[PDB]
Amino acid sequence: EPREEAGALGPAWDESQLRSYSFPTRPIPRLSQSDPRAEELIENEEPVVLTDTNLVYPALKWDLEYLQENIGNGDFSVYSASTHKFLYYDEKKMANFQNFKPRSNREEMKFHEFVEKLQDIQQRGGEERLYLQQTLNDTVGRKIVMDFLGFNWNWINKQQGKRGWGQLTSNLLLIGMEGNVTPAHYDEQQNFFAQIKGYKRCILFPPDQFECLYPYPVHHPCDRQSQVDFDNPDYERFPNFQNVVGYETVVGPGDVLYIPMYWWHHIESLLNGGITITVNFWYKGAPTPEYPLKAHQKVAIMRNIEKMLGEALGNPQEVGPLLNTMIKGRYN
Amino acid sequence: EPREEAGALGPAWDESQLRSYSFPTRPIPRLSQSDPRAEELIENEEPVVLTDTNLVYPALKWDLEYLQENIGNGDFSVYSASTHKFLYYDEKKMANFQNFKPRSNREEMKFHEFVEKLQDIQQRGGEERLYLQQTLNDTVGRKIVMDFLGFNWNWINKQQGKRGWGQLTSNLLLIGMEGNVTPAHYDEQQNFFAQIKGYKRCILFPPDQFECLYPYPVHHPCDRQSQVDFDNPDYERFPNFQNVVGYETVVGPGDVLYIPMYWWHHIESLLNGGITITVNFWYKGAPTPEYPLKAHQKVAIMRNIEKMLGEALGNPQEVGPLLNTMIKGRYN
Amino acid sequence: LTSYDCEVNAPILQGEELLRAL
Amino acid sequence: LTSYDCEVNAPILQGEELLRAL
Ligand SMILES: O=C(O)CNC(=O)C(=O)O
Ligand SMILES: O=C(O)CNC(=O)C(=O)O
Ligand SMILES: [Zn+2]
Ligand SMILES: [Zn+2]
């Protein structure tokens, strides 16, 4: 049930703002950072929404005006799409799949340019959609630098130390239009996902649901993304999607969602909820040291096999036929 | 067409002595050792029957009486079976497949014991079948040692040198009853197969027919053997067996069949042809050094993947499910 | 085999380096 | 990956060793 905003400002959002899907879900726990149960969850690589870390406390005031004024003159990657779905793709892998035609294009622009584009669409009632996704770097301005420095490093550093994680590799700034969706995928890093403006519905699936989510081949540009179209699932090609079960939540300003490494996640900015802003914190996982093997370890194994085969055969397109040749009449 | 034996002794064998199968074949070339075409074939890892190497010239006089008298008091492995089919199995791998029940059993005995058993079966009109298969070693007697030393080492050593092969690992003595069959399999060594007494029909398939022959899993005791029952093929489990095409020949005393590493072979002692005797020469292949990859190289790759997965998962029985999980909805 | 890389839905100063520099 | 073992339908003096000894 949607939470009530302090001061009797009503419900933060309602059901009608959620897209509808074919699968059930259970709620991710929302807990205080001081609650031992939250620590148990993170330690165990299970998701949890933390309500009071103050992780990005100083960014809570951010909005397009403040960012345009302070974020510098660096370039920003902005994706453009004609659908609500922003399927991630790896440009470096495009050569090996000449027939893949991305539904979204990346354009580099200045922040003011991004803001202007958002304005032109609104005014012209256009259907175009934009999603800015850009790692925070040295070119940001003074005020932003001050804000960044005011993040709760004390808490997040203890988290990094307590779990044996590797280094912070980056913080991605995500600014999206209402209704935008990042389709289901898994990342190979641990993520603290800090919501700043607006509301995002996050649906997660554990690594042991690999069989139900059907990731693209490792050498395909959509490596790590699910092939299933959540809006129109093809149960013929992906029969086990009929067995998928999610853990869901809606995060708002101030909330931090722990998205554990290898966990699938589908993220959507609420319909009619305005622009969203998020900043993530990506950490390399702990080192690989016992049976029985964990689901995520098996996933690590499958990726490696695919990778080795691709190199050994000299053509990634030869990966499938060999695998098929290996199992038919033998293991299936 | 069956050859004519010197001195007008008639046909060496006839069609009625061949078992019947569902697939077609083409003849393997029979050539003189001095013929350049024979050298081209071996160089290219293609089968050839050499008619005049004199490779085991001194063994042409061997028969059960001479061997019983001269082969020593060492132990001999003898397989016993109630079917004509002597499917090879690796005893060391039996623990990992508790449910595999071999159709043949191995018994160690003295040569005279083997000969006696052959006699008791004949006399008692029994249906039992025996196949002796034993590596030649130090315990053989003086006369046999003399015979072995008289093999044409000059020719076979040049062959080993010309092809870059590794060392002679062994020579297997095979003594079989008429009608015995060794079902289709591939060996990881190069083989010069020297026929001594009786006639054997040898049907070979190139390594690129892997998809049609359906070898057992690498960790299964029948690793390297085809799962298809040539006498009653199940086209439902093994549909591509309907596309298999063999290279066949019948070898007799004095002939040497080159069976190239990784080539499938099915070997049968002619029906009503009496006992057969053969001695093989197994050499390690040349070293692994260019695209496009050869069929046998791909086979090498598949074995390795299976092997690595088995070790990595800690249970070979987990190999299939992981592979299946890797391809369904992804590569198939 | 059990070893893993660090790929995510973003291309490869930032992270730890950004922070320390600041 | 392309590397291979030397397994055949027989268990593991003989071969080269038998010959030289003789
Ligand atoms: O917020 C989004 O739309 C996408 N974010 C992620 O997938 C992520 O942070 O790992
Ligand atoms: O002769 C036989 O029955 C079996 N021989 C082989 O499979 C071989 O020599 O490689
Ligand atoms: Zn992600
Ligand atoms: Zn063989």
XYZ file of C-alpha atoms and ligand atoms in Angstrom:
730
model
C 0.000 0.000 0.000
C 1.450 3.375 -1.007
C 3.025 5.278 1.870
C 1.658 8.546 3.198
C 3.819 11.656 2.712
C 4.622 13.600 5.884
C 2.388 16.530 6.621
C -0.732 14.874 5.213
C 0.356 15.509 1.627
C -1.412 12.351 0.630
C -0.260 9.231 -1.062
C 3.071 9.473 -2.794
C 1.674 7.499 -5.780
C -1.129 5.081 -6.710
C -1.622 1.743 -8.454
C -2.723 3.379 -11.699
C 0.832 4.670 -12.109
C 2.266 1.128 -12.285
C 2.541 -0.729 -15.573
C 0.878 -4.135 -15.574
C 2.700 -7.446 -16.068
C 2.058 -11.204 -16.186
C 3.880 -12.168 -13.040
C 3.372 -11.906 -9.323
C 5.747 -10.250 -6.865
C 6.395 -9.953 -3.150
C 7.579 -6.764 -1.450
C 11.145 -5.951 -0.719
C 11.560 -5.031 2.947
C 11.851 -1.306 3.868
C 13.952 -0.883 6.931
C 15.959 1.545 8.913
C 19.647 1.451 8.430
C 20.106 0.792 12.151
C 17.923 -2.315 12.000
C 19.957 -5.526 12.328
C 17.664 -7.164 9.794
C 18.902 -4.781 7.151
C 22.453 -5.743 7.826
C 21.585 -9.431 7.627
C 20.039 -8.877 4.213
C 22.990 -7.055 2.673
C 25.443 -9.530 4.183
C 23.441 -12.234 2.478
C 23.202 -10.497 -0.856
C 19.472 -9.957 -0.654
C 17.746 -6.733 -1.568
C 16.562 -4.174 0.953
C 15.289 -0.652 0.796
C 16.980 1.553 3.429
C 14.910 4.584 4.337
C 17.310 6.686 6.437
C 20.953 6.414 5.254
C 21.087 10.027 4.234
C 23.418 8.662 1.544
C 22.685 11.467 -0.929
C 21.109 13.878 1.478
C 22.650 16.917 -0.315
C 21.295 15.850 -3.674
C 17.701 15.944 -2.488
C 17.456 19.567 -3.640
C 18.639 18.759 -7.164
C 16.303 19.501 -10.069
C 16.934 20.457 -13.697
C 17.377 24.143 -12.895
C 19.998 23.584 -10.181
C 21.873 20.985 -12.261
C 21.858 23.082 -15.413
C 23.257 25.928 -13.338
C 25.951 23.859 -11.590
C 26.892 20.626 -13.289
C 29.507 22.039 -15.657
C 30.050 22.015 -19.400
C 31.035 18.351 -19.740
C 29.365 16.075 -22.297
C 26.326 13.988 -21.247
C 25.189 10.710 -22.845
C 21.498 10.912 -23.656
C 19.485 8.129 -25.146
C 16.588 8.809 -27.375
C 13.830 6.358 -28.132
C 10.462 6.024 -29.704
C 9.263 3.431 -27.183
C 9.105 3.480 -23.405
C 11.749 0.745 -23.354
C 15.418 1.713 -23.088
C 17.151 -1.615 -23.745
C 20.824 -1.237 -22.886
C 23.285 -2.248 -25.605
C 27.052 -2.421 -25.846
C 28.250 -0.571 -28.864
C 31.611 -2.439 -28.960
C 29.776 -5.650 -29.646
C 27.721 -4.333 -32.565
C 30.208 -5.474 -35.279
C 29.627 -9.139 -34.426
C 25.866 -8.815 -34.879
C 25.442 -6.731 -38.043
C 21.703 -7.498 -37.961
C 21.025 -5.907 -34.554
C 19.148 -2.642 -34.916
C 18.937 -0.670 -31.670
C 15.629 0.880 -30.755
C 17.465 3.690 -28.977
C 20.344 5.965 -30.069
C 22.945 7.699 -27.944
C 23.739 11.373 -28.428
C 26.353 13.384 -26.546
C 25.282 16.834 -25.503
C 25.667 19.565 -22.940
C 23.293 19.585 -19.965
C 21.546 22.723 -21.100
C 21.026 20.988 -24.435
C 19.424 18.045 -22.705
C 17.170 20.356 -20.742
C 16.222 22.269 -23.900
C 15.348 19.034 -25.712
C 13.110 18.013 -22.784
C 11.358 21.366 -23.053
C 10.825 21.163 -26.844
C 9.209 17.748 -26.538
C 6.841 18.819 -23.778
C 5.764 21.961 -25.631
C 5.394 20.243 -29.002
C 3.454 17.387 -27.394
C 5.971 14.991 -28.990
C 6.120 11.250 -28.263
C 9.945 11.139 -28.242
C 11.548 10.025 -24.995
C 14.883 10.780 -23.468
C 16.964 9.144 -20.824
C 20.174 10.764 -19.577
C 22.752 8.337 -18.229
C 26.154 9.649 -17.409
C 28.884 8.846 -15.021
C 29.766 11.684 -12.667
C 33.302 12.966 -13.398
C 35.782 15.834 -12.964
C 33.988 18.271 -15.192
C 31.109 18.844 -12.795
C 31.046 22.256 -11.134
C 31.851 23.516 -7.644
C 28.434 23.356 -6.084
C 27.994 19.745 -7.354
C 31.378 18.800 -6.065
C 30.292 20.171 -2.660
C 27.094 18.126 -2.833
C 28.978 14.941 -3.793
C 31.409 15.390 -0.989
C 28.449 15.676 1.394
C 27.174 12.191 0.528
C 27.292 9.833 3.552
C 30.687 8.305 2.773
C 31.037 7.293 6.390
C 28.138 4.835 6.079
C 28.787 3.607 2.598
C 32.537 3.057 3.253
C 31.722 0.889 6.283
C 29.378 -1.083 4.056
C 32.163 -1.563 1.497
C 34.496 -2.639 4.305
C 32.043 -4.904 6.072
C 31.217 -6.900 2.857
C 34.758 -7.184 1.473
C 33.777 -5.360 -1.678
C 36.212 -3.989 -4.195
C 36.453 -0.348 -5.226
C 33.771 2.173 -6.157
C 33.998 2.114 -9.960
C 31.443 4.822 -10.567
C 28.298 6.684 -9.868
C 25.831 6.926 -12.685
C 23.482 9.882 -12.826
C 20.136 8.838 -14.278
C 17.523 11.383 -15.317
C 14.429 10.015 -16.977
C 11.033 11.031 -18.219
C 7.914 9.644 -16.626
C 7.022 6.248 -18.030
C 10.631 5.394 -18.997
C 11.635 1.774 -18.480
C 14.991 0.075 -18.241
C 14.238 -3.529 -19.165
C 15.324 -6.419 -17.007
C 19.029 -7.167 -16.753
C 21.741 -8.060 -14.260
C 24.998 -6.129 -13.534
C 28.285 -7.687 -12.393
C 28.745 -5.154 -9.605
C 27.122 -4.479 -6.286
C 24.838 -1.443 -6.360
C 23.490 0.988 -3.817
C 20.732 2.770 -5.801
C 19.963 6.203 -4.386
C 16.691 7.813 -5.363
C 16.642 11.580 -5.508
C 13.612 12.957 -7.354
C 10.404 11.224 -8.322
C 9.468 7.613 -7.918
C 10.754 4.472 -9.552
C 9.240 1.021 -9.386
C 11.985 -1.577 -9.122
C 11.254 -5.271 -9.789
C 14.068 -7.684 -8.959
C 14.597 -11.409 -9.575
C 17.211 -13.586 -7.872
C 20.044 -15.139 -9.837
C 18.376 -18.564 -9.611
C 15.760 -17.394 -12.012
C 18.291 -17.388 -14.845
C 16.239 -20.209 -16.545
C 13.140 -17.991 -16.602
C 14.676 -14.727 -17.888
C 16.600 -15.818 -20.969
C 19.516 -13.400 -21.294
C 20.935 -12.703 -24.725
C 24.159 -14.485 -25.712
C 27.256 -13.103 -24.058
C 28.714 -11.754 -27.366
C 25.479 -10.061 -28.372
C 25.232 -6.356 -27.635
C 22.396 -6.967 -25.208
C 24.550 -9.253 -23.136
C 23.082 -9.424 -19.591
C 19.611 -8.151 -20.641
C 16.573 -10.480 -20.732
C 15.254 -11.345 -24.207
C 11.677 -11.454 -22.962
C 9.471 -8.526 -23.802
C 7.712 -7.974 -20.527
C 4.844 -6.215 -22.311
C 4.235 -9.163 -24.694
C 5.899 -12.351 -23.552
C 6.416 -15.058 -26.078
C 5.798 -18.199 -24.021
C 6.750 -20.342 -27.014
C 10.323 -19.148 -27.096
C 10.485 -18.527 -23.355
C 8.212 -20.992 -21.595
C 9.775 -20.642 -18.147
C 8.911 -16.968 -18.033
C 5.546 -18.323 -16.921
C 7.279 -19.310 -13.663
C 9.044 -16.017 -12.846
C 8.395 -14.339 -9.472
C 9.621 -10.875 -8.538
C 10.476 -8.878 -5.432
C 9.200 -5.349 -5.897
C 9.228 -1.930 -4.386
C 8.749 1.700 -5.167
C 11.500 4.026 -4.087
C 11.244 7.731 -3.591
C 13.434 10.659 -2.562
C 15.713 9.603 0.254
C 15.383 5.872 -0.241
C 18.314 3.581 -1.118
C 17.763 0.222 -2.731
C 20.466 -2.360 -2.385
C 20.625 -4.256 -5.693
C 22.916 -7.200 -5.136
C 25.342 -8.275 -7.804
C 23.839 -10.680 -10.368
C 20.239 -9.894 -9.323
C 17.987 -9.096 -12.264
C 16.257 -5.747 -12.109
C 13.569 -3.974 -14.118
C 13.209 -0.270 -13.316
C 10.396 2.020 -14.296
C 9.719 5.682 -13.672
C 6.053 5.989 -12.615
C 3.537 6.937 -15.272
C 2.520 10.558 -14.848
C 5.066 11.039 -12.032
C 7.305 13.602 -13.687
C 11.040 13.286 -14.214
C 13.087 10.997 -12.074
C 16.564 11.363 -10.801
C 18.772 8.696 -9.344
C 22.415 8.267 -8.511
C 23.916 4.779 -8.153
C 27.043 3.524 -6.449
C 28.697 0.585 -8.241
C 31.289 -1.492 -6.391
C 33.331 -4.440 -7.671
C 32.352 -7.586 -5.872
C 34.460 -9.357 -3.290
C 37.046 -11.887 -4.452
C 36.211 -15.414 -5.527
C 37.672 -17.568 -2.704
C 32.716 -24.593 -1.153
C 29.856 -26.716 -2.393
C 27.067 -26.612 -3.023
C 27.645 -23.791 -5.587
C 25.499 -20.672 -5.473
C 23.281 -19.662 -8.350
C 25.424 -16.641 -9.115
C 28.479 -18.806 -9.301
C 26.838 -21.015 -11.891
C 26.000 -17.873 -13.845
C 29.658 -16.870 -13.678
C 30.530 -20.245 -15.056
C 28.129 -20.048 -18.020
C 29.455 -16.640 -19.034
C 32.982 -17.965 -18.937
C 32.192 -20.964 -21.097
C 30.555 -18.700 -23.680
C 33.474 -16.353 -23.618
C 36.109 -19.123 -24.040
C 34.215 -20.778 -26.884
C 33.962 -17.489 -28.725
C 37.682 -16.967 -28.529
C 38.530 -20.575 -29.313
C 36.368 -20.846 -32.388
C 37.439 -17.452 -33.675
C 33.845 -16.396 -34.401
C 31.193 -15.801 -31.723
C 28.511 -16.785 -34.178
C 29.909 -20.274 -34.035
C 29.119 -20.537 -30.295
C 25.559 -21.697 -30.673
C 26.041 -24.481 -33.198
C 28.855 -25.973 -31.178
C 26.770 -25.908 -27.960
C 23.866 -27.435 -29.801
C 26.104 -30.057 -31.222
C 27.326 -30.771 -27.679
C 23.909 -31.412 -26.118
C 21.567 -32.904 -28.665
C 21.028 -36.519 -28.142
C 23.645 -36.310 -25.421
C 22.478 -34.136 -22.500
C 18.936 -33.056 -23.444
C 33.654 -57.297 -54.653
C 35.489 -59.842 -52.494
C 39.078 -60.439 -53.559
C 40.319 -63.740 -54.932
C 42.836 -65.667 -52.804
C 46.089 -66.586 -54.553
C 46.243 -70.042 -56.020
C 42.567 -70.103 -56.995
C 41.464 -70.743 -53.415
C 38.318 -68.826 -54.142
C 36.779 -65.804 -52.587
C 38.140 -64.860 -49.208
C 34.577 -64.139 -47.962
C 31.077 -63.314 -49.244
C 28.287 -60.806 -48.652
C 26.312 -63.219 -46.486
C 29.054 -62.919 -43.866
C 28.424 -59.174 -43.408
C 25.878 -57.891 -40.917
C 23.288 -55.559 -42.408
C 22.834 -51.903 -41.433
C 20.725 -48.840 -42.282
C 23.422 -46.734 -43.842
C 25.383 -46.629 -47.049
C 29.168 -46.728 -47.346
C 31.934 -46.162 -49.863
C 35.108 -48.250 -50.034
C 38.329 -47.348 -48.384
C 41.172 -47.445 -50.907
C 43.502 -50.507 -50.908
C 46.933 -49.533 -52.031
C 50.513 -50.548 -52.052
C 52.713 -48.967 -49.504
C 54.947 -47.627 -52.279
C 52.039 -45.807 -53.915
C 52.260 -42.026 -53.452
C 48.493 -41.920 -53.044
C 48.793 -43.913 -49.861
C 51.215 -41.442 -48.441
C 48.933 -38.550 -49.347
C 46.091 -40.213 -47.472
C 47.978 -40.812 -44.235
C 49.497 -37.333 -44.351
C 45.966 -36.027 -44.588
C 44.571 -38.177 -41.826
C 42.366 -40.218 -44.112
C 42.016 -43.967 -43.925
C 43.784 -46.377 -46.241
C 44.320 -50.086 -46.343
C 47.973 -50.940 -47.101
C 48.383 -54.390 -48.592
C 52.164 -54.931 -48.523
C 53.843 -53.314 -45.472
C 54.871 -56.633 -44.045
C 54.295 -54.824 -40.739
C 53.526 -58.010 -38.793
C 54.896 -60.472 -41.273
C 56.187 -62.796 -38.486
C 52.818 -62.923 -36.784
C 51.097 -64.360 -39.835
C 51.791 -67.869 -38.525
C 50.174 -67.171 -35.154
C 47.173 -69.262 -34.121
C 45.867 -70.388 -30.730
C 48.214 -73.369 -30.554
C 51.376 -71.349 -31.239
C 50.324 -68.542 -28.870
C 49.343 -70.890 -26.068
C 52.740 -72.525 -26.459
C 54.737 -69.270 -26.562
C 53.001 -66.237 -25.141
C 53.994 -66.739 -21.508
C 52.143 -67.046 -18.223
C 51.057 -63.408 -17.919
C 47.432 -62.469 -17.220
C 45.083 -61.744 -20.160
C 41.964 -59.542 -20.056
C 39.042 -61.415 -21.565
C 35.596 -60.011 -21.989
C 32.584 -62.185 -21.833
C 29.204 -61.285 -23.231
C 25.825 -62.655 -24.026
C 25.390 -60.475 -27.120
C 27.536 -60.022 -30.200
C 28.213 -56.448 -29.086
C 31.296 -55.709 -26.983
C 30.677 -52.100 -25.935
C 33.862 -50.745 -24.389
C 33.510 -49.201 -20.929
C 35.874 -47.479 -18.538
C 35.698 -49.070 -15.161
C 37.148 -45.987 -13.377
C 34.119 -44.005 -14.398
C 31.546 -46.491 -13.102
C 31.159 -44.819 -9.651
C 29.705 -41.669 -11.218
C 26.999 -43.627 -13.034
C 25.725 -46.140 -10.465
C 22.887 -47.035 -12.856
C 25.113 -48.235 -15.719
C 25.004 -52.002 -16.054
C 27.618 -53.366 -18.457
C 26.553 -56.021 -20.906
C 30.058 -57.482 -20.810
C 32.354 -58.449 -17.903
C 36.130 -58.572 -17.790
C 37.952 -61.585 -16.389
C 41.711 -61.985 -16.035
C 43.063 -65.364 -16.979
C 46.005 -67.254 -18.375
C 46.146 -67.839 -22.133
C 45.615 -71.553 -21.797
C 42.548 -70.724 -19.720
C 41.221 -68.521 -22.479
C 41.821 -71.250 -25.022
C 40.119 -73.833 -22.794
C 37.072 -71.588 -22.357
C 36.835 -71.193 -26.154
C 36.904 -74.972 -26.476
C 34.211 -75.583 -23.816
C 31.831 -73.179 -25.524
C 32.297 -74.730 -28.951
C 31.801 -78.270 -27.651
C 28.824 -77.398 -25.454
C 27.229 -75.434 -28.302
C 26.989 -72.463 -25.906
C 25.928 -68.953 -26.954
C 28.514 -67.222 -24.726
C 31.056 -65.060 -26.518
C 34.566 -64.085 -25.644
C 36.857 -61.344 -26.754
C 40.483 -61.237 -25.603
C 42.013 -57.772 -25.509
C 45.386 -57.372 -23.952
C 48.326 -55.136 -24.351
C 51.531 -56.941 -25.271
C 54.066 -56.689 -22.410
C 57.243 -58.127 -20.860
C 55.734 -61.399 -19.790
C 55.423 -62.778 -23.307
C 57.815 -65.602 -24.151
C 60.966 -65.862 -26.252
C 59.479 -66.941 -29.533
C 56.890 -64.096 -29.325
C 59.567 -61.619 -28.487
C 61.420 -62.797 -31.624
C 58.256 -62.359 -33.683
C 57.623 -58.858 -32.284
C 61.137 -57.804 -33.002
C 60.640 -58.964 -36.598
C 57.771 -56.526 -37.186
C 58.635 -53.920 -39.866
C 59.850 -51.228 -37.469
C 61.797 -49.635 -40.280
C 58.580 -48.722 -42.115
C 56.445 -47.870 -39.156
C 59.166 -45.684 -37.540
C 59.476 -43.644 -40.747
C 55.714 -43.215 -40.663
C 55.905 -41.984 -37.060
C 58.704 -39.610 -38.066
C 57.105 -38.370 -41.256
C 53.788 -37.420 -39.494
C 55.275 -35.865 -36.346
C 53.517 -38.382 -34.156
C 54.280 -38.945 -30.517
C 55.386 -42.245 -29.014
C 54.072 -45.776 -29.484
C 51.954 -46.195 -26.345
C 50.998 -49.790 -26.970
C 50.051 -52.686 -29.105
C 46.798 -54.374 -28.294
C 46.364 -58.033 -29.129
C 42.769 -58.743 -30.113
C 41.449 -62.282 -30.454
C 37.766 -62.627 -31.171
C 35.138 -65.164 -32.043
C 33.353 -65.017 -35.356
C 30.465 -62.576 -35.278
C 32.003 -60.422 -32.506
C 31.454 -56.687 -32.863
C 33.171 -53.706 -31.322
C 30.574 -50.948 -31.573
C 31.364 -47.584 -33.073
C 33.733 -45.301 -31.197
C 36.684 -42.977 -31.702
C 40.167 -43.205 -30.064
C 42.429 -40.244 -29.258
C 45.472 -41.893 -30.817
C 46.609 -42.690 -34.307
C 46.294 -46.383 -35.145
C 47.908 -48.746 -37.594
C 45.605 -51.808 -37.385
C 47.377 -54.988 -38.449
C 45.244 -57.963 -39.368
C 46.728 -61.367 -38.719
C 44.148 -64.162 -38.842
C 40.640 -64.126 -40.230
C 38.701 -61.242 -41.643
C 37.277 -58.135 -40.057
C 34.869 -55.676 -41.599
C 35.799 -52.149 -40.574
C 33.331 -49.263 -41.030
C 34.722 -45.788 -40.384
C 33.134 -42.330 -40.140
C 35.004 -39.020 -40.269
C 35.122 -36.722 -37.269
C 32.654 -34.341 -38.946
C 29.942 -36.858 -38.414
C 30.003 -36.209 -34.672
C 26.392 -34.819 -34.959
C 25.179 -38.127 -36.415
C 26.861 -40.577 -34.000
C 25.893 -39.245 -30.583
C 28.728 -40.210 -28.240
C 27.969 -40.741 -24.578
C 28.835 -37.925 -22.156
C 32.523 -37.591 -21.430
C 32.140 -38.670 -17.745
C 30.050 -41.707 -18.607
C 31.895 -45.009 -18.783
C 31.126 -45.309 -22.475
C 32.853 -42.042 -23.185
C 33.870 -41.986 -26.888
C 31.415 -44.756 -27.918
C 28.288 -43.984 -29.989
C 24.961 -44.293 -28.144
C 23.201 -45.534 -31.262
C 22.440 -49.211 -31.463
C 23.407 -49.963 -35.016
C 21.136 -53.021 -35.035
C 18.055 -51.006 -33.946
C 18.513 -47.282 -34.344
C 16.220 -45.023 -32.441
C 15.676 -42.176 -34.906
C 13.646 -40.305 -32.291
C 16.554 -39.861 -29.936
C 19.140 -39.788 -32.712
C 17.574 -38.293 -35.818
C 20.832 -37.425 -37.575
C 21.873 -41.054 -37.628
C 19.648 -41.112 -40.700
C 22.341 -39.006 -42.406
C 25.434 -41.072 -41.518
C 27.699 -42.341 -44.325
C 30.566 -44.771 -43.823
C 33.838 -45.725 -45.481
C 34.192 -49.487 -45.340
C 36.560 -52.301 -46.010
C 37.316 -55.860 -45.132
C 40.829 -56.603 -44.014
C 42.525 -59.945 -44.005
C 45.879 -61.471 -43.089
C 48.656 -59.138 -44.131
C 46.549 -56.023 -44.491
C 47.062 -52.861 -42.405
C 44.302 -50.340 -41.954
C 45.258 -46.833 -41.016
C 42.604 -45.567 -38.584
C 43.249 -41.881 -38.111
C 42.876 -40.287 -34.723
C 39.307 -39.164 -33.938
C 37.793 -41.243 -36.777
C 34.851 -43.352 -35.658
C 35.184 -47.054 -36.303
C 32.910 -50.082 -36.036
C 34.715 -53.421 -36.331
C 33.184 -56.808 -36.874
C 34.648 -60.271 -37.223
C 32.893 -61.948 -40.182
C 30.002 -64.263 -39.422
C 31.098 -67.864 -39.818
C 34.711 -66.789 -40.473
C 36.358 -68.369 -37.454
C 38.471 -66.576 -34.876
C 40.163 -63.341 -35.704
C 43.454 -61.998 -34.603
C 44.692 -58.460 -34.851
C 47.496 -56.401 -33.421
C 47.251 -52.596 -33.339
C 49.866 -49.890 -33.028
C 48.688 -46.831 -31.070
C 50.673 -43.597 -31.314
C 50.060 -40.288 -29.532
C 49.113 -37.629 -32.007
C 51.330 -34.765 -33.072
C 51.336 -31.580 -31.000
C 48.627 -28.948 -31.169
C 50.379 -25.982 -32.864
C 44.911 -21.591 -38.073
C 41.314 -21.100 -39.098
C 39.075 -22.474 -40.232
C 39.158 -25.129 -37.436
C 39.083 -28.810 -38.330
C 36.293 -31.085 -37.210
C 38.594 -32.982 -34.885
C 39.656 -29.777 -33.255
C 36.060 -28.892 -32.502
C 35.668 -32.345 -30.979
C 38.701 -31.657 -28.800
C 37.045 -28.479 -27.696
C 33.732 -30.121 -26.737
C 35.493 -32.748 -24.640
C 37.401 -30.050 -22.830
C 34.307 -28.033 -22.033
C 32.622 -31.136 -20.615
C 35.658 -31.978 -18.588
C 36.034 -28.447 -17.109
C 32.350 -28.202 -16.222
C 32.490 -31.520 -14.421
C 35.376 -30.372 -12.300
C 33.957 -26.908 -11.716
C 30.542 -28.046 -10.597
C 31.961 -30.812 -8.437
C 29.519 -33.393 -9.829
C 29.540 -34.653 -13.430
C 25.832 -35.284 -13.217
C 25.388 -31.553 -13.025
C 26.946 -31.097 -16.495
C 23.791 -31.634 -18.474
C 21.442 -29.321 -16.603
C 23.928 -26.490 -16.764
C 24.430 -26.954 -20.538
C 20.702 -27.103 -21.023
C 20.279 -24.023 -18.965
C 22.907 -22.337 -21.157
C 21.216 -22.986 -24.511
C 17.471 -23.032 -24.100
C 15.871 -19.957 -25.373
C 19.361 -18.623 -25.951
C 21.214 -20.624 -28.632
C 18.690 -23.237 -29.815
C 35.790 -20.512 -14.093
C 33.958 -19.198 -11.047
C 35.733 -15.909 -11.633
C 33.795 -12.862 -12.769
C 34.222 -9.551 -14.493
C 32.660 -6.220 -13.539
C 30.372 -5.300 -16.436
C 27.305 -3.091 -15.939
C 24.848 -1.027 -18.020
C 27.388 1.770 -18.582
C 30.664 2.103 -20.531
C 34.117 1.794 -18.893
C 38.003 10.742 -13.255
C 35.224 8.733 -11.635
C 34.355 6.454 -8.719
C 37.050 6.133 -6.062
C 39.348 8.350 -8.148
C 36.813 11.153 -8.431
C 36.233 11.135 -4.656
C 39.888 11.196 -3.611
C 40.805 13.855 -6.159
C 37.954 15.950 -4.699
C 41.105 -25.858 -25.390
C 42.209 -27.356 -28.691
C 44.479 -29.622 -26.685
C 43.778 -33.336 -26.476
C 44.461 -36.367 -24.363
C 45.373 -39.862 -25.544
C 42.485 -42.090 -24.464
C 41.619 -45.293 -26.340
C 39.584 -48.492 -25.834
C 42.183 -49.990 -23.470
C 43.416 -49.184 -19.939
C 46.619 -47.193 -19.242
C 56.424 -52.681 -20.076
C 54.622 -51.830 -23.304
C 54.781 -49.731 -26.469
C 58.060 -47.900 -27.030
C 59.346 -49.211 -23.687
C 58.636 -52.834 -24.542
C 60.462 -52.501 -27.880
C 63.609 -50.843 -26.539
C 63.863 -53.206 -23.579
C 63.666 -56.072 -26.109
O 17.549 3.376 -13.042
C 17.565 2.780 -14.110
O 16.729 3.036 -14.946
C 18.612 1.746 -14.463
N 19.593 1.428 -13.419
C 20.222 0.267 -13.338
O 19.923 -0.677 -14.105
C 21.215 0.181 -12.405
O 21.437 1.139 -11.687
O 21.905 -0.851 -12.240
O 39.403 -54.785 -33.438
C 38.528 -54.406 -32.671
O 37.570 -55.116 -32.464
C 38.597 -53.090 -31.926
N 39.750 -52.234 -32.222
C 39.734 -50.917 -32.087
O 38.674 -50.316 -31.797
C 40.929 -50.278 -32.253
O 41.914 -50.932 -32.548
O 41.060 -49.039 -32.129
Zn 21.320 -2.173 -13.663
Zn 39.256 -48.320 -31.545
